[PDB]
Structure formats: C-alpha cells, structure tokens
Write a protein that binds this ligand. Structure first.
Ligand SMILES: CN(CC(N)=O)C(=O)c1nc(-c2ccccc2)[nH]c1C(=O)O
Length: 146
C-alpha cells in the first residue's frame, strides 16, 4: 500500500479499512494509487496551547486542545458527508490568515512547512483530505489540491 498505509479492522463493523499514520486519513476502500512540489489548502483550529493562541477570529484563543480536536472532527464529518465543503468551512472557521483564500496555501517544496504538516501534505494523493494533523500552530485538516 502507498507511504503510511496500514490495514486495520473496524471497531463497530468488524469490516477491514485502511488508516494512514502520516496523514491520519481513514477510508473503507483499499488505496490503489513523490512529486517535488504539492499544493494544499488547510483549515486550522488553534487552542490555548498553540504557539500563537490568537487569530483573525478571536483575539484570545482559550479552547483546549481536546475541544479543538472535537471541532476538527465535526468539520471532517460535514465535509465527508458533503453537508459542507472544505472551502466553505476553511473560509468561516480556519484560525489561519489563509482562511480569506479558502485556505489555499499555494505550492510548496519539502523543507518549507512544519514537518508534520509537510509530511502529511506529501503523503496525500491529489484531491485527498487528511485527518487531524497536529503541529505547534494547532490542529489542521489538509486538502491536497495539486
Ligand atoms: C505561524 N504561526 C505561529 C507559530 N509559531 O506556529 C501560526 O500560528 C500560524 N501557522 C499557520 C500555518 C501553519 C501551517 C501551515 C500553514 C500556515 N498559520 C498561522 C497564523 O497564525 O495565521
């Protein structure tokens, strides 16, 4: 299976699924399908322990890391169900200044982003969205777009 993928058994179903320990993605289908540069968007939820606990949305970020993960997990659910799209939630709720660009960060090479962010970005397939990715900025959902 490609970089980071493992087979697991589901807790509720007993059905096989696939987990990526680099992107935190999980899916039922087996993944079937490294570039010099990728383009990604993200949605960042900061918490009280973030490096800079402040954003355009809230001068003082006070939510806990656990409450930030809860928020991230709700956004992932709405995006996977198609109830909301990624761009719309990033524009409204991302604690990054890239919110005003629907979360788009542009293209980047290895060696530019925080490591856990980079590693997740380069392990995603074009079109594919990460699970929760933790960095010192806070918690991210990453969408690889190119
Ligand atoms: C850069 N930084 C402070 C830090 N020392 O991590 C942030 O917290 C931050 N980090 C990001 C970020 C993090 C990863 C990838 C792209 C952007 N955006 C912000 C922001 O405020 O707007």
């Amino acid at each position: 299976l490609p970089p980071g993928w493992e087979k697991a058994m589901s807790r509720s179903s007993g059905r096989v699924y696939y987990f990526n320990h680099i992107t935190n993605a999980s899916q039922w289908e087996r993944p079937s399908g490294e570039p010099a540069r990728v383009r990604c968007s993200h949605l960042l939820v900061k918490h009280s322990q973030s490096r800079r606990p402040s954003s355009w949305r809230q001068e003082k970020i006070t939510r806990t890391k656990e409450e930030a993960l809860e928020l991230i997990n709700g956004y992932i659910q709405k995006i996977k169900s198609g109830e909301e799209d990624f761009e719309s939630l990033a524009s409204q709720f991302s604690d990054c200044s890239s919110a005003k660009a629907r979360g788009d960060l542009g293209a980047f090479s290895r060696g530019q982003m925080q490591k856990p962010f980079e590693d997740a970005s380069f392990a995603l397939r074009t079109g594919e969205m990460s699970g929760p990715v933790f960095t010192d900025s806070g918690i991210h959902i990453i969408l690889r777009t190119e």
